[PDB]
Design a protein around this nucleic acid. Structure first.
Ligand SMILES: [K+]
Ligand SMILES: [K+]
Ligand SMILES: [K+]
Ligand SMILES: [K+]
Ligand SMILES: [K+]
Ligand SMILES: [K+]
Ligand SMILES: [Mg+2]
Ligand SMILES: [Mg+2]
Ligand SMILES: [Mg+2]
Ligand SMILES: [Mg+2]
Lengths: 124, 100, 193, 208, 126
RNA sequence: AAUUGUCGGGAGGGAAGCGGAUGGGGGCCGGCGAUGCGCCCCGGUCGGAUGUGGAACGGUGACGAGCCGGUCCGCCGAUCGACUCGGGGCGUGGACCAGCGUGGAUUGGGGGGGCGGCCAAAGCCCGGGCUUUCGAUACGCCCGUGGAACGCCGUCUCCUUGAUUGUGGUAGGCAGCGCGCGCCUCCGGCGUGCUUCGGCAUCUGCGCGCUCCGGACGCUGGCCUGUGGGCUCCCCAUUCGA
RNA sequence: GAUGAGUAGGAGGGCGCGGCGGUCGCUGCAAAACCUUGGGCGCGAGCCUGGGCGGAGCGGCCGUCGGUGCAGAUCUUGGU
């Protein structure tokens, strides 16, 4: 015998692929698997890991909070693995380059009217 | 931005050979083993030849006076090594122990 | 250079002993700085402290072997598990044969056979150890980087003794196998490697 | 061209001389001096362009696996020291089991060429595997026996009737062998008699 | 057809794993069932008792599911399904389904002979 | 299905049944186990340019131009190629099972040699002195750089053997080393440096090769419709277990 | 590369039965069911197939659903 816990095997479980059956999400996962393998970029690894997560683990971000966090960084492309919702409490919308898994219709309309763009992760 | 593609990562594991049996593996791990073996074999052959010829030299590492000093020191050390106690501390067992 | 150094140390020890005898005094040999520890009991019915110490020594299987630098902390740790192990002072031949025949390195927590000097280099090049002989010298001399080199060595998986054991339930002093058997560990290593 | 080896082998794979002595003996210094302090550079041999193989008539649906290279090459079979030309051998297997025969030479394939002689015990010129033979201490002169023209090809099948040429060759070979045998007294009877184990005879104790 | 397989087929066990006591009670069938009884000696693996299957008996992946002839089985119900093996005749053999009529079996056999596809039961219903 | 009769095989000293290993007998199996391949000669069929026209069409481009391209049909030259077409030659070749050879891995034995440590062994022997005994003719002590042969321990090496086994399949890699690129009188010798005076990875480069070198290859035989080979099937016997 | 015990208990991947929406098939040149010291595949649940009998239907695959898997319950009914 060998004095090991569970024969030296791991007892922690983590997501290794999306549980969803969305074909577009699967294609994005393939894209970022390739990117992670052939680039070794920490950002790409984080994106790939978040692509696996469940709905509650990909909470939405409000438009007002996005504007607040993008203050002074409007030249950078803001990336969120999740949904971006509109906020009726936000009055002035600047021109923002935003990439997300999905945009609500109102949020997309406001972002496009303000002069920004809404991007998908392949475009990113 | 992709790093160069890799094709020679999936190499089969090299079979482990004991360096103590086969020479090439030992030399690969330690090249000086070749020289060590050569010198050992040559020294053994020279010693065997000297023994067989019976023409061996008369080598004295230590001179006569220091050899005598060494012998005296060794004799004294042996004398103290084999020495015994007087057993005089056991007065009640003096007769039994053969002291008197 | 290492081979010359070993020969010089042996000659110096012999000369020191002879000179001490000539002067009429005594020469106290330097205390062993290195030990080899072999587990001789199984993993059944283990007391908590003994089990924890045996894990800390990396002895999880019967007849596993590991080197251990001599220290008050390490010696006191070994004193608690004495009944479960036997240990002594390994020879140069013992160390060399162990590393050559059963030496496995730990790279990224994996067990890789030391079939090339590159395996040793990849882990211990920062410390100047780039070859098998360098590793042997570091282990035997307990050099400044002994800890890293020793941890790099996977615990040795030794076979059952060729001639068997005497009695593993008793100390070596009583005629058993447990405990410090000092220079006689080398013959046991011969039979176990 | 050097007529003698520069570095005799103490053992297999180890030379008697070191790299410095080998440098001195090989004359690299002389070559450098003659060439002007620099070794002469030799161009790499040009590879032969592959022949224009005609296009295949068929295309397999599967990629056949090419075996990996094996760097080990077989060496010639060793001949036991106890077996030397003229040694008497005991056959332990086959239709001639127990027969005592004279050893002539070892062939290229490693098999042993032996003769009865044919007249004495009916054993012709034949090949016997060394693993099925015992070499004894009895030796007979075979210097006058000529078997140069006989080789492994002499016994090759051409695929019932023994040609007369083989009989004549066997007679010619056996004439000198019998002449040599007659010198040793009682050797004729010894070769005409088979070996057998009687009661309380232990193979591991017989010296042969 | 020359089979592509080269490694020899090795079976770790050729005996069936018969249910315990199926020899004793007629109502207990042979098909394997793992005992769950608290005292079951078979479950406890007492020596000299009925052996239980486990993953350790698994066949080598290279020779797994290979028939003794060196090919793998594929069931074909008509000649149209036979052409699927046209490019796999060195690894796959065709077995005609048990319910196919003799008339269709002849056509399947002829087509396979044309395609050099091995049929395991080409003599059935002849 | 339980259960029962008949016929046939088999077993049975106070249960039977069952797990593992062989064997006897039976039953079954021909994808159970091949006969092809390459190079030539003869004969028979079918087609043969990068040339010139026609039919439809494609890749790319921008379902434009331009460039490039295949299929089919008809012609002038070219006189070649193919055939699971036939005949004749040379070479080579299959599945399974054994024997043998040379080696790799792992492993258990046998026979030697060198060196070192010890009271710098102890003892024994050779000479120079001292000592003088009861198990009566001993125990003995040291002087020599005196001489052979051991003992134990450690260490470095050579040779020779039996057993199990070959996992992988695009690499001439890695390591070590020979021959040529100089000569002589060729068991070897000749140059520069450092040496403990033995020697040294100090000069050590190229081309061609060799090996204990990134996991087994080679030769031979037997047999192929047989009273052969195989078997996970069946009935039994035996050893162990139960 | 390391590693392998498991009652109560948890979970994953699979096997099997009967319908529904689709799809691909089989069948009087013989379907289902049943029978068989015929053969084979899978560690296994099971699966594929030879032969027989039977004489009119049946199956594979993707989803989806359920009155869906027995050795026991002094279990039920029937039979012996
Ligand atoms: K039953
Ligand atoms: K289990
Ligand atoms: K072998
Ligand atoms: K259907
Ligand atoms: K059946
Ligand atoms: K269904
Ligand atoms: Mg282990
Ligand atoms: Mg106890
Ligand atoms: Mg019945
Ligand atoms: Mg229902």
């Amino acid at each position: 015998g060998i004095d090991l816990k569970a024969g030296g095997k791991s007892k922690k479980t983590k997501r290794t692929a999306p549980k969803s059956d969305d074909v577009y999400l699967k294609l994005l996962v393939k894209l970022y698997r390739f990117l992670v393998r052939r680039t070794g970029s920490k950002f790409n690894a984080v994106i790939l890991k978040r692509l696996f997560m469940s709905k509650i683990n990909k909470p939405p971000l409000s438009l007002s909070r996005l504007i607040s966090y993008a203050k002074g960084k409007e030249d950078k492309v803001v990336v969120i693995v999740g949904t971006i919702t509109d906020d009726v409490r936000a009055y002035e919308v600047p021109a923002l380059k935003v990439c997300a898994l999905r945009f609500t219709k109102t949020a997309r309309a406001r972002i496009e009217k303000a002069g920004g763009e809404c991007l998908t992760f392949d475009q990113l | 931005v992709v790093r160069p593609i890799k094709k020679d990562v999936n190499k089969r594991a090299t079979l482990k050979k004991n360096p103590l049996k086969n020479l090439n593996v030992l030399l690969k791990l330690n090249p000086y083993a070749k020289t060590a073996r050569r010198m050992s074999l040559l020294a053994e052959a020279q010693r065997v030849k000297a023994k067989k010829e019976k023409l061996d030299k008369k080598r004295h590492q230590v001179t006569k006076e220091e050899a005598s000093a060494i012998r005296a020191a060794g004799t004294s050390w042996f004398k103290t090594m084999i020495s015994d106690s007087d057993y005089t501390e056991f007065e009640n067992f003096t007769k039994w122990l053969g002291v008197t | 250079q290492y081979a010359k150094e070993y020969e010089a140390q042996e000659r110096e020890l012999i000369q020191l002993k002879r000179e001490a005898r000539l002067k009429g005094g005594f020469y106290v040999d330097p205390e062993a700085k290195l030990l080899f520890i072999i587990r001789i009991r199984g993993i059944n019915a283990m007391a908590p402290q003994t089990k924890k110490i045996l894990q800390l020594l990396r002895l999880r299987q019967i007849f596993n072997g590991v080197f251990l630098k001599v220290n008050k902390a390490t010696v006191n740790m070994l004193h608690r598990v004495e009944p479960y192990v036997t240990y002594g002072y390994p020879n140069l031949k013992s160390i060399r044969e162990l590393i050559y025949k059963r030496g496995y390195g730990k790279v990224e927590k994996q067990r890789i056979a030391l079939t090339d000097n590159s395996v040793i280099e990849q882990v211990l090049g920062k410390h100047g150890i780039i070859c098998i002989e360098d590793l042997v010298h570091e282990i035997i001399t307990v050099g400044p980087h002994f800890k890293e080199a020793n941890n790099f060595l996977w615990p040795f998986q030794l076979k059952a003794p060729l001639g068997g054991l005497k009695k593993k339930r008793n100390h070596y002093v009583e005629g058993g196998d447990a405990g410090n058997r000092e220079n006689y560990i080398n013959e046991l290593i011969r039979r176990m490697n | 061209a050097k007529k003698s080896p520069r570095n005799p082998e103490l053992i297999r794979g180890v030379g008697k001389l070191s790299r410095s002595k080998m440098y001195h003996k090989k004359g690299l210094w002389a070559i450098k001096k003659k060439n002007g302090g620099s070794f002469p550079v030799h161009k790499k041999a040009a590879a032969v362009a592959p022949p224009a193989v005609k296009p295949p008539k068929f295309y397999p649906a599967d990629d056949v696996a090419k075996p990996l290279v094996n760097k080990h090459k077989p060496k010639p079979t060793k001949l036991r020291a106890s077996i030397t030309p003229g040694t008497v051998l005991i056959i332990l297997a086959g239709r001639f089991k127990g027969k005592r025969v004279v050893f002539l030479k070892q062939l290229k394939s490693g098999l042993l060429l032996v003769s009865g002689p044919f007249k004495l015990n009916g054993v012709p010129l034949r090949r016997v595997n060394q693993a099925y033979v015992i070499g004894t201490s009895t030796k007979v002169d075979i210097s006058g026996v000529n078997v140069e023209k006989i080789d492994d090809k002499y016994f090759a099948k051409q695929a019932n009737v023994l040609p007369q040429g083989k009989k004549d060759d066997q007679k010619a070979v056996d004439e000198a062998l019998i002449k040599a045998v007659e010198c040793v007294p009682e050797l004729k009877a010894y070769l005409s008699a088979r070996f057998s184990l009687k009661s309380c005879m232990k193979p591991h104790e017989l010296v042969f | 057809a020359v089979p592509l397989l080269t490694k020899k087929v090795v079976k770790k066990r050729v005996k069936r794993f018969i249910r315990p006591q199926s020899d004793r009670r007629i109502t207990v069938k042979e098909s394997w069932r793992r005992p769950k009884g608290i005292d079951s000696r078979v479950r406890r693996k007492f020596k000299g008792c009925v052996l239980m299957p486990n993953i350790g008996y698994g066949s080598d992946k290279k020779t797994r599911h290979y028939l003794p002839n060196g090919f793998k089985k594929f069931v074909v119900h008509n000649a149209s399904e036979l052409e699927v093996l046209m490019m796999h005749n060195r690894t796959y053999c065709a077995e005609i389904a048990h319910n196919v009529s003799t008339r269709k079996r002849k056509e399947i056999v002829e087509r396979a002979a044309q395609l050099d596809v091995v049929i395991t039961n080409k003599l059935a219903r002849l």
